[PDB]
Amino acid sequence: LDAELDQLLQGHYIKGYPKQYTYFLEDGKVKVSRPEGVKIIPPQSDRQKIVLQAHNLAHTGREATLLKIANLYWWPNMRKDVVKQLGRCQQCLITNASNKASGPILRPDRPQKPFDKFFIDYIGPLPPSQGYLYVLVVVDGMTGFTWLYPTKAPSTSATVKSLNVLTSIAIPKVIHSDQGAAFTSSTFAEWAKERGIHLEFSTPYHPQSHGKVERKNSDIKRLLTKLLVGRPTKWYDLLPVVQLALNNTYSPVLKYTPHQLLFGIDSNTPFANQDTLDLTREEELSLLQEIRTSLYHPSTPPASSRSWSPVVGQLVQERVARPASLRPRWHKPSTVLKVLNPRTVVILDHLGNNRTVSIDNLKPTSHQ
Amino acid sequence: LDAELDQLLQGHYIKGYPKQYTYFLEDGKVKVSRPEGVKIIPPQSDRQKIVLQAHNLAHTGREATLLKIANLYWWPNMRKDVVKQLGRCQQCLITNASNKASGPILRPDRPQKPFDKFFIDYIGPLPPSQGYLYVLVVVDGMTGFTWLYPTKAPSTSATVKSLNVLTSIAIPKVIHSDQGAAFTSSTFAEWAKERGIHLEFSTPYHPQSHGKVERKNSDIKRLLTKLLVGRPTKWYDLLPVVQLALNNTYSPVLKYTPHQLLFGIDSNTPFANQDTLDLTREEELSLLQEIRTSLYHPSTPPASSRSWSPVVGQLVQERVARPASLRPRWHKPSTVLKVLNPRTVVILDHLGNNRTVSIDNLKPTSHQ
Amino acid sequence: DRPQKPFDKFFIDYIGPLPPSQGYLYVLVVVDGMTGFTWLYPTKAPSTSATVKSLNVLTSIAIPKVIHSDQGAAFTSSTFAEWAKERGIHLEFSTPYHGKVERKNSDIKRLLTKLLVGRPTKWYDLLPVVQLALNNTYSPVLKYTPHQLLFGIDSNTPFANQDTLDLTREEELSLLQEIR
Amino acid sequence: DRPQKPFDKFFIDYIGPLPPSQGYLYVLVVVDGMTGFTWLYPTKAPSTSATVKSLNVLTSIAIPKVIHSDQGAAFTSSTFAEWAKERGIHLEFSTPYHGKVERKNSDIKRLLTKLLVGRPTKWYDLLPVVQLALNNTYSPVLKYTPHQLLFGIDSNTPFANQDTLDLTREEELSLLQEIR
DNA sequence: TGCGAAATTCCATGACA
DNA sequence: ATTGTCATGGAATTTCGCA
DNA sequence: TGCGAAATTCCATGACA
DNA sequence: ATTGTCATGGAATTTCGCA
Ligand SMILES: CCN1C[C@H](C)n2c(c(O)c3c(=O)n(Cc4ccc(F)c(Cl)c4)nc(C(=O)NC)c32)C1=O
Ligand SMILES: CCN1C[C@H](C)n2c(c(O)c3c(=O)n(Cc4ccc(F)c(Cl)c4)nc(C(=O)NC)c32)C1=O
Ligand SMILES: [Mg+2]
Ligand SMILES: [Mg+2]
Ligand SMILES: [Mg+2]
Ligand SMILES: [Mg+2]
Ligand SMILES: [Mg+2]
Ligand SMILES: [Mg+2]
Ligand SMILES: [N+]
Ligand SMILES: [N+]
Ligand SMILES: [Zn+2]
Ligand SMILES: [Zn+2]
Numbered sequence A, B: 001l002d003a004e005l006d007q008l009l010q011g012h013y014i015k016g017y018p019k020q021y022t023y024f025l026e027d028g029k030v031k032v033s034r035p036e037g038v039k040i041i042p043p044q045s046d047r048q049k050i051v052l053q054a055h056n057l058a059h060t061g062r063e064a065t066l067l068k069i070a071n072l073y074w075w076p077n078m079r080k081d082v083v084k085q086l087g088r089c090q091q092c093l094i095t096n097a098s099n100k101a102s103g104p105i106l107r108p109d110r111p112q113k114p115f116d117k118f119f120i121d122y123i124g125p126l127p128p129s130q131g132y133l134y135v136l137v138v139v140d141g142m143t144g145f146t147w148l149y150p151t152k153a154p155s156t157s158a159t160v161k162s163l164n165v166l167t168s169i170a171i172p173k174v175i176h177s178d179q180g181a182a183f184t185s186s187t188f189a190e191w192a193k194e195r196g197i198h199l200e201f202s203t204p205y206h207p208q209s210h211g212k213v214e215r216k217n218s219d220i221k222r223l224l225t226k227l228l229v230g231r232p233t234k235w236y237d238l239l240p241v242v243q244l245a246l247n248n249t250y251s252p253v254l255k256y257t258p259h260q261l262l263f264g265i266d267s268n269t270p271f272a273n274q275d276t277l278d279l280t281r282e283e284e285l286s287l288l289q290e291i292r293t294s295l296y297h298p299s300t301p302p303a304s305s306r307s308w309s310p311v312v313g314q315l316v317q318e319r320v321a322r323p324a325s326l327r328p329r330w331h332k333p334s335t336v337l338k339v340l341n342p343r344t345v346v347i348l349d350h351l352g353n354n355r356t357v358s359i360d361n362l363k364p365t366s367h368q
Numbered sequence C, D: 001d002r003p004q005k006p007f008d009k010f011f012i013d014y015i016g017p018l019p020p021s022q023g024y025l026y027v028l029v030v031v032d033g034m035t036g037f038t039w040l041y042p043t044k045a046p047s048t049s050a051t052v053k054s055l056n057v058l059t060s061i062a063i064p065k066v067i068h069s070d071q072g073a074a075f076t077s078s079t080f081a082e083w084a085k086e087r088g089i090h091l092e093f094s095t096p097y098h099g100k101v102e103r104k105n106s107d108i109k110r111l112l113t114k115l116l117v118g119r120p121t122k123w124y125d126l127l128p129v130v131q132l133a134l135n136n137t138y139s140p141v142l143k144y145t146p147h148q149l150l151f152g153i154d155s156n157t158p159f160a161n162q163d164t165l166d167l168t169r170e171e172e173l174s175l176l177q178e179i180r
Numbered sequence E, G: 001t002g003c004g005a006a007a008t009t010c011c012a013t014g015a016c017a
Numbered sequence F, H: 001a002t003t004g005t006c007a008t009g010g011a012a013t014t015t016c017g018c019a
Helices: A002-009 A044-056 A062-070 A078-086 A090-095 A156-166 A186-193 A207-228 A236-247 A258-263 A281-293 B002-009 B044-056 B062-070 B078-086 B090-095 B156-166 B186-193 B207-228 B236-247 B258-263 B281-293 C048-058 C078-086 C100-115 C123-135 C146-151 C169-175 D048-058 D078-086 D100-115 D123-135 D146-151 D169-175
Strands: A023-026 A029-034 A037-040 A117-123 A134-140 A146-151 A174-177 A198-201 A315-318 A334-341 A344-348 A354-358 A362-364 B023-026 B029-034 B037-040 B117-123 B134-140 B146-151 B174-177 B198-201 B315-318 B334-341 B344-348 B354-358 B362-364 C010-015 C026-032 C038-043 C066-069 C090-093 D010-015 D026-032 D038-043 D066-069 D090-093
Touching: A002 A023, A002 A029, A044 A062, A044 A078, A062 A078, A090 B207, A117 A207, A134 A156, A134 A207, A146 A156, A146 A207, A146 A236, A156 A186, A186 A198, A207 A236, A207 B090, A236 A258, A258 C146, A315 A344, A334 A354, B002 B023, B002 B029, B044 B062, B044 B078, B062 B078, B117 B207, B134 B156, B134 B207, B146 B156, B146 B207, B146 B236, B156 B186, B186 B198, B207 B236, B236 B258, B258 D146, B315 B344, B334 B354, C010 C100, C026 C048, C026 C100, C038 C048, C038 C100, C038 C123, C048 C078, C078 C090, C100 C123, C123 C146, D010 D100, D026 D048, D026 D100, D038 D048, D038 D100, D038 D123, D048 D078, D078 D090, D100 D123, D123 D146
Parallel strands: A117 A174, A174 A198, B117 B174, B174 B198, C010 C066, C066 C090, D010 D066, D066 D090
Antiparallel strands: A023 A029, A029 A037, A117 A134, A134 A146, A315 A334, A315 A362, A334 A344, A344 A354, B023 B029, B029 B037, B117 B134, B134 B146, B315 B334, B315 B362, B334 B344, B344 B354, C010 C026, C026 C038, D010 D026, D026 D038
């Protein structure tokens, strides 16, 4: 404060204030003659308030805030005081965008067997067709084999009815889905437990986590579209055709159709593959077990040059899921409890609840 | 047809059919013994129909279509016949996604003077405030200096009232905007012509073309948000504050505020720059002319590895602007009349109208 | 002669009338010849219409080369013939009035009867578990369940409790009270 | 003494009452001292409230260091004083009852009177062009228009037709019919 | 043991609300 | 207390037919 | 004529419906 | 018959204070 600035005026040396400059009093204020011109050196006790005034004009970041201040003032290490303030501006922290990308995606192992894991989701609402509005899409993780069910609503009960029809064929170990109301209801949990099925949920608002089914939605809509060109959008009668069509389509990277991966032999559909005509079923199932283990598996891509990865104890902010107009896009800062993997974390949200959350719905809080 | 396949059976050589394979009759069909097994060679006259059957199962692209066919058939140059068919499938062409990126963006020269070009746009609807729902945002191209006007609707008449208040200060040579109803109405054109103002329109649904104002919208909403944190969204009284705040904020790459670029001297606002205190106004305006010509100008970035660029006479498809559910995302193919620049073209749309269109709303039609 | 495979031949047949359950009265039974895998479909009648509606569901998962049945009206109609022709399915009929499949069909009737006692009306809901039981039931002849033969893997519902399948003295007298 | 600059001093004053136009009666006149640039605002009254409402628009574009006015009630009120203090504007008053600005103010009154004849009621709409005329009018003393001095560029509306500014014999007699 | 062309593989692009 | 995916069609690379 | 640290510049990231 | 932009805050690079 006034003490430090006194020593300064009478020629003494203070750490941070370069001795090679001429410091003086004028208009009752300590000034200095810097290459860019004469600036006021406010007392340390004044500085916080100045930075705040500068920042608050437009809630500007580091440089734009500094440039305002530098117009009138100089003191040692200005930006440190700027950054200190930015880190304490709740409005800036919850409103600004991130400028760091997530670390590279994980490519989890393909489930080992058919029926190990189902990925499920709803598409819709679609145009009304026979009074139906939605599609339940069920994708077997290992095979890509897909089941389609039309529904009137994306509800637990319609999910339960459909899954009862499906699970007539086989029961899966795990069913994985997003946190839609249909899948998180206790009624659905009882239905799962009753049958030995473990429910696994994606982190909230991160449909990539169950990307298999999401990607199949795309193909389903794409084929429905092509088939409905120039007709009214009567899709109900097309569901079965699309199911069969997609289950018997080749993935060019795999060289197999989901049907082939499920059964190891084409059924009586057009252009059925005849290669195993002379094998016994047992020989065929043996070649199948082999084909299933040797399928192409993609690898984790290179990180972008400015990615960030979560560290226990770090301050991070969850993305607001459905931000209202003129409201912040980010929640208040929270703390990383556990790093489950480099792309998923548990945070404590200031309330404080535990939330398991995708890195893609997080930014690291700026300025520590 | 049956002629070609006759010569083949009696050991003769036909171009395309490798002589080193054993060709025979069986079940009344010409077969061949290929490393992958025995395939039928259909007669040339049968082939188109086969490819079509294969493709139509799921409207599959090249490889997935080929893999179906190869199950039962072989003939020379199968994929050529596949590609021929894909190029003729209207449903595939108007529904599939592009897999080629646009060429790199242009960075047009900054307008040379204040008032050479205005970029204008509406933000909204926002939450009601004093009965207002929209903001007219006017951005001077050279300075970034911005004017904000609250409106009840994004209409010509509200635009006209606002621009009359603004053009009291100065008249611009050009006003550039998107093709919103407010700006394309004949009433607005008469208003422009009356005052010597040329109206310039961005290509449809390409807000990057007038990116200056779009980017300013972001800052406007961002600052409004910060200011409204924890209060009800009463933004009307904040417009003037935001205007002033933004016009006096530094662009860190420029080292100037839009106000400085407009006037060459700060008004009586907090942290006013004092550097030209000793210059005469005339000296100040001289330094200003100089600052205006030496502003950083960004350069066109490197092209992505799989970009495409338009060529006169090429078949291309305009993106459907507001595709209904289960309807194609692309219009029928059209023809490039003129290449205005590597990022903008005139097309003839089969109706056939002339349309000036952004490359970003185009894909090149596949398989020629 | 090439070896027998799944989807080579589906054996279909109707069971019923049964006591009403959710308005349904019959069961369409489909057994794959080679694997012995069973699919069941509740119908309101043993008609060609009900058969087509049911097999349309099945044939959106797998299409048989051949369907085999007795000369039931539902199967010998020209509508059913047209339906099959559209899908490239050959129809096959056993001569009027006269292995693996025959045994499976017996198991189904017997398994059904054991469960429609004390609840002759709740069978609609039981169909899924009936099927799972049937398809995860060990075959004495081959070393494998139908599940294993269709999918080439073990099931997550192994039915290791090979159940009586016989009527207990409680059910024998409770079944003769049902007819009364 | 540092040289005179834009925003150093705004000279404000009211003109009116005028004949009603869109319910407005007065004009708040703001002239920048250094550039001679003029901003005009239609008001319903020469009150502190109307002044604040008007200057709030102007001060969202540019804030003067000093406002100068006569001792009009609207300007000497403590509300106006508070308003100025909030914005860090020093208020300045000429003594009661007694260059570039004075001339500009004369031009405004004269230009206004020349246009409110034959249409004494359409002036609200004419304000924009009045201002553009005023600000693209050549200054005899300096070589430059107010536009040029404020923005450091030529204008896209140069008023090369330096108009009479005087009343023609048609308007002189048409103005003495207006008062009658 | 090397050529021209066909086949196959590679892989950026974009879309799943 | 969890996790992207994969059809697509030009381009790049490999293999084929022949010698 | 070179060190450590501060200042400045660089620039990927994301959002404008 | 037209065309992306630019605040942001860590990182990279340059300049400063001193010797
Ligand atoms: C209510 C529970 N709930 C949460 C959110 C609404 N959600 C749910 C979905 O099924 C989807 C969905 O399919 N896509 C499409 C999409 C977008 C980008 C991608 F990378 C991928 Cl793989 C998929 N987006 C969202 C979403 O989060 N939008 C912001 C979404 C859902 O059911
Ligand atoms: C009706 C006339 N019309 C056409 C479309 C509706 N449009 C209009 C707008 O003002 C915007 C707009 O601000 N943004 C936001 C945006 C998105 C990406 C960017 F790169 C940038 Cl620079 C801006 N998007 C669209 C749009 O085209 N959405 C699909 C848009 C407009 O008025
Ligand atoms: Mg969902
Ligand atoms: Mg989804
Ligand atoms: Mg717009
Ligand atoms: Mg816009
Ligand atoms: Mg029978
Ligand atoms: Mg007066
Ligand atoms: N994993
Ligand atoms: N340009
Ligand atoms: Zn802030
Ligand atoms: Zn097609």
